Design a protein around this ligand. Structure first.
Ligand SMILES: Nc1ncnc2c1ncn2[C@@H]1O[C@H](COP(=O)(O)OP(=O)(O)NP(=O)(O)O)[C@@H](O)[C@H]1O
Ligand SMILES: [Mg+2]
Ligand SMILES: [Mg+2]
Lengths: 20, 336
């Protein structure tokens, strides 16, 4: 499921803004 | 509404033209605990000595700001935040700087990030997501009317107050601009295609971001996700969006109009502006005035036991806030 794929991903925690 | 926005602009312009400066100092607060960290600053719960009130102090290391090329952005952030006034925007109570850091002291929103509740619960039902979405729509109508683009909408930047209402924080990428701008900034999952494509963009990017936010709130995951930002950008540009089976037909229709790659078709950026959104079937049950007036019963009220309680926030490793005896980047931050 899409939910399962998201949960197993590396981006489920707080996301910080883009910084160059 | 047009009557209200006109007066609002007068108030904003006065503060934009003559910004508040040096309204407090470090030793007037007792630093308690870190509430959150980002790519740029650290926000700590603090207690103001003379009043006894708690606040959320955003601390920015001047050298880090310079290193990350956020000088102009940080000046934008503070100049804009001190000039705005809206029910769903966090209030800047004080601001000041010292040899090493820049400080922005906001009202402490104890309910925690929408992010934490969203991840814990899994997802928000449609009426629940709608309640929050309405507040963002009104806030963007307000900001946009002042020629301001927000540029960082995401659950991590949205706080839930004691009454269950939204308080938008983090004006790090906020900018006052008439026309288009080009900075590649924001958070990966929320970037509109035009930002990624480096073609120049306008306030319409906030409306795209709203689409991403509504989708994430209702689904429990973003419309475009992957392990690395580059993969996310590929997905965003492709434009293909899939909706959970539980999404109502009305919600899907609204989302197809917000997550619209075509600027001539994206809701919020058309002839009727924000009205295409307010009048959309998904918001039919929304009493816009009642929302603005905070008269609607919140779908969720965070638990809070007394002032100073940080139970609605994750714990972070504490770090010493150093202050050199030599002033750093004085000229750069003169207006702060
Ligand atoms: N007024 C407030 N009350 C309570 N918590 C807050 C407040 N303002 C910010 N926070 C918390 O502090 C975190 C960081 O604040 P923020 O202004 O977003 O720093 P930032 O470095 O600009 N983050 P980002 O750019 O998105 O990577 C937020 O995500 C919240 O968890
Ligand atoms: Mg943030
Ligand atoms: Mg930020």
């Amino acid at each position: 499921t899409t939910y399962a794929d998201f949960i197993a991903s590396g981006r489920t925690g707080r996301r910080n803004a883009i910084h160059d | 509404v047009k009557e209200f926005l006109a007066k609002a602009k007068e108030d904003f312009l006065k503060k934009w033209e003559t910004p508040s400066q040096n309204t407090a100092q470090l030793d007037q607060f007792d630093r308690i605990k870190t509430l959150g960290t980002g790519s740029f600053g650290r926000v700590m719960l603090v207690k103001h000595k003379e009043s006894g009130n708690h606040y959320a102090m955003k601390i920015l290391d001047k050298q880090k700001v310079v290193k990350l090329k956020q000088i102009e952005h940080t000046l934008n952030e503070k100049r804009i935040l001190q000039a705005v006034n809206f029910p769903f925007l966090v209030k800047l109570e004080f601001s000041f700087k010292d040899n090493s850091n820049l400080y922005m002291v906001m009202e402490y929103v104890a309910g925690g990030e929408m992010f934490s509740h969203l991840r814990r619960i899994g997802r928000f039902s449609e009426p629940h997501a709608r309640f929050y979405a309405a507040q963002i729509v009104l806030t963007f109508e307000y900001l946009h009317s002042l020629d301001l683009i927000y540029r960082d909408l995401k659950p991590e930047n949205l706080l839930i107050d004691q009454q269950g209402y939204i308080q938008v924080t983090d004006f790090g990428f906020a900018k006052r601009v008439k026309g288009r701008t080009w900075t590649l900034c924001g958070t990966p999952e929320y970037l509109a295609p035009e930002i990624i494509l480096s073609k120049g963009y306008n306030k319409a990017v906030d409306w795209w971001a709203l689409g991403v936010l509504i989708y994430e709130m209702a689904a429990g995951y973003p419309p475009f996700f992957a392990d690395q930002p580059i993969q996310i950008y590929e997905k965003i540009v492709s434009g293909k969006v899939r909706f959970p089976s539980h999404f109502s037909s009305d919600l899907k229709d609204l989302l197809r109009n917000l997550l619209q790659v075509d600027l001539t078709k994206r809701f919020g950026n058309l002839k009727n502006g924000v009205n295409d959104i307010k009048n959309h079937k998904w918001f039919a049950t929304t009493d816009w005035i009642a929302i603005y007036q905070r008269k609607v019963e919140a779908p969720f009220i965070p638990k809070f036991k007394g002032p100073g309680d940080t139970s609605n926030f994750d714990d972070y490793e504490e770090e010493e806030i150093r202050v050199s005896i030599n002033e750093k980047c004085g000229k750069e931050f003169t207006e702060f």
